[PDB]
């Protein structure tokens, strides 16, 4: 389990995961419907990206989102 | 009649026995490691069945590999548990089935 | 002249040897590998009077355990790091077929264990016989055992073809098997695209015997199991009666289990599996229509790798022709619906 | 006390349950985060269409940590 | 006219009793409580000799352990459920002050343990003397102990005022204490708004003795502690000698530790803590400027609860006016900020 | 000098000892419950110090109750933990300091 420090931290972790699986941005666009430009913004800092798109990308990468205290 | 010991990753994790009612696999009451199969979860301890468990039956060899062994001592497929013990130190992965003696 | 491991053209300094330095290093970890076995076929492989005509081609195949002791292959009694698979006495050139198909799978991007063709020591002045060699995947860095299990035992199926009922019907399909896999491994688009491609490529290449024992789960990254590498991938296209027996080892779709329904492709003028049935398999795995369409276009573009790999292989000319004929026909069927 | 979030809506509901157990109203959250009470309302019902940064800022003000696993 | 527990107006029948049914039930759990102690002051409270003028009023205050056997208060040697705090011999009416201040804190919305004023059995025909009683927070639904610890031991400070150096300077401030709390308890804006208000209200009301031993951590959730309820909240405004010794028990800001810097309010024409100093404390806790502005408006609107609670109390009239005079002055200083 | 058993929730959690070099608090090697203080984490076992630990010093009284107890006992000026054992069964929270 990794605690997400900021939105930027999450985009970087999702991008590291994407690259270790060998998935390109075009494959993710076809599967999620999210454009390669939004995917680019998402992997750098998802701050302004809609929550549902961040959640859909985490899902296609096999990443689970958890909440704690 | 047979109380075969099952060892995963070098150490014995449990026992697979045979009797009148059928077969029974049970993990040791002090084994809290990984399961030998997703069909035999670590959380549950006892595994009774009328026929030999699909995991242990899947470990028995196919066509050529079982005919080469059934030519040495002559096993007419009657006892599948005795055939598992003949290939005990030659199984795939980290599973090893050895006798109790 | 092509490499007996990689099937790539041999350079001037490798030509006479028959193996490339790149290939010898890929297979053994050293360019000092000796791919000329110090033993004959009959020294370790025995000819036992066969079962009966009706068993799958894998049942007739001998398997030897091999260890790599100082650049030399040595036959071991149990738990070796490589497996030697000579051609069955009744199926000559099968080792060359498994080598071509497994080389093609590596060139296509699949996780395939390192492999090649090795020659036995000749008895007299007869032409050299080759066997297929492959590194065992249930080994890590320095041959320590990695735990694994076959899909038939994991799913609790008593037959490797799913013939578990009161009739002669198959009760497990690729669709059901994929659904089971998605619930036990890490569920990601890379895993899903790969598994979908493995099923489409078993069909395109004529591997109609990719049953439940030909799928595995390897317990490497702690708790989370992974799908085992591609193994035992052979084209049955050079053997007409085996090829005709089935299009695939298991039914493709869940609706086909127990023979309750036919796949849409069976109800079409084609009367066999078509592109539409594979789209339905993709859809069941969660793959998006726009992604499945792209994945099909990639399969069309990989035509050149398929043609070239089989034509560069040590398979007989008649056998290559049979494989490419199966391939071209099934590749053309992917455009349908 | 680790909960896997199933859908965006599941997270919105958990954040709203947490907000109510702390006695925090929507106006207090608007003053602290800058997120409007109407966006906060949409967020606590289904943050699917709400920006990630706003969901992350609200989870923060509520003392809720976001984690990632496999 | 007013209840000796709640300070609310007493109805027709309860007038002679002096306690309301609502109040008796709040404090004991039953409307059958007897708030007239069956013991006299000298029976249990010894007269210890005065120590030195240097210690705070809390040093001169006796403390008795009380248990509730039926509807009667009983003095215990150890591990009671309530604590009786009689007025020190030199500070008459201090129990009435702690009662007014603690009642005000409850009316303001803080977590305050249940409390009231109880009378001792008289020796002869003299006027009744009252002591402040409060339920122990280190007890759950039943009298089972709940673990807790004081902030001085948690932060590893050897003095409750942070006088831990080679001089008389203070090395722990409310800003540092809040930063320590934020790292050990759950963060959230509700905890932060409450703790900020506790510090502003200790200043507004004249509680210049809210030191490190006057903050606690309760272990209710198990692993993660919570901040302990408000306790020992007394206004020192009726005692000029004690009131002018300090504005607060500890320095407000971290910049003031060791006397290295003055708070910006000390550099202004006011020469004491002003609203700007509290905005800097709020800012250090992560509170947003628009939220701090609203919080200040909420404190201004609570003027009526402060005035009314002290005027409804059993404190002397001279004592009430000293408190309200401190309060009005400091409340007016809250406007002096950007 | 002396050794005492530190109890939390009625159970012996560890020991606090004193000698020439100073004081030492140590949790029992088999105690995997909650820490008695955030200043004494259970992850760390040994806690040596020249003076009495701020947690144990904070447990001792200060004003009127320490004065009422001191006039009838009259033990050594700097008897840091000697005063804590006398008021061991009368502490705040769930802590108890008993003689060994």
Numbering used by the authors:
A (entry chain D): 39 to 107
B (entry chain E): 2 to 102
C (entry chain F): 2 to 338
D (entry chain A): 38 to 107
E (entry chain C): 2 to 339
F (entry chain B): 2 to 101
Which statements did the authors publish about this structure?
Enteropathogenic *E. coli* (EPEC) O127:H6 encodes an additional, tripartite TA module, *hipBST*, for which the HipT toxin was shown to specifically target tryptophanyl-tRNA synthetase, TrpS. Surprisingly, the function as antitoxin has been taken over by the third protein, HipS, but the molecular details of how activity of HipT is controlled remain poorly understood. Here, we show that HipBST is markedly different from HipBA and that the unique HipS protein, which is homologous to the N-terminal subdomain of HipA, has evolved to function as antitoxin by breaking the kinase active site. We also show how auto-phosphorylation at two conserved sites in the kinase toxin serve to dually regulate binding of HipS and kinase activity.
To understand the individual roles of the two autophosphorylation positions, we next determined crystal structures of two HipBST complexes with HipT serine residues mutated to alanine individually: HipBST^S57A^ (2.4 Å, [Table tblS1]) and HipBST^S59A^ (3.4 Å). The phosphate groups on Ser57 (in S59A) and Ser59 (in S57A) are shown in orange and relevant nearby residues are highlighted. **b.** Close-up of the HipT active site as observed for the S57A mutant with relevant active site residues shown as sticks. In both structures, however, the Gly-rich loop maintains its outward conformation, incompatible with ATP binding, suggesting that HipT is inactive. The phosphate group on Ser59 occupies a position very similar to phosphorylated Ser150 in HipA_Ec_, despite the fact that this residue aligns to Ser57 at the sequence level ([Fig figS4], **top and 1b**). This position structurally overlaps with the γ phosphate of ATP in the structure of ATP-bound HipA_Ec_, suggesting that phosphorylation prevents nucleotide binding in the kinase active site ([Fig fig4]). Here, we observed a marked difference in migration between HipT from wildtype HipBST, HipBST^S59A^, and HipBST^S57A^ confirming that HipT^S57A^ is predominantly phosphorylated while HipT^S59A^ is only partially modified, consistent with the crystal structures. In summary, we conclude that the conformation of the HipT active site loop (Gly-rich loop) inside the HipBST complex is independent of the autophosphorylation state. We still don’t understand what controls whether HipT becomes modified at one or the other position but the structures of HipT^S57A^ and HipT^S59A^ could suggest that subtle changes in the loop can make a big difference ([Fig fig4]). Free HipT could then form three populations, non-phosphorylated HipT, HipT P-Ser57, and HipT P-Ser59. Furthermore, HipT P-Ser59 would readily be able to (re-)bind HipS, and therefore form a stable and inactive HipBST complex as well as tightly bind the *hipBST* promoter, effectively shutting down the kinase activity, halting the expression of new protein.
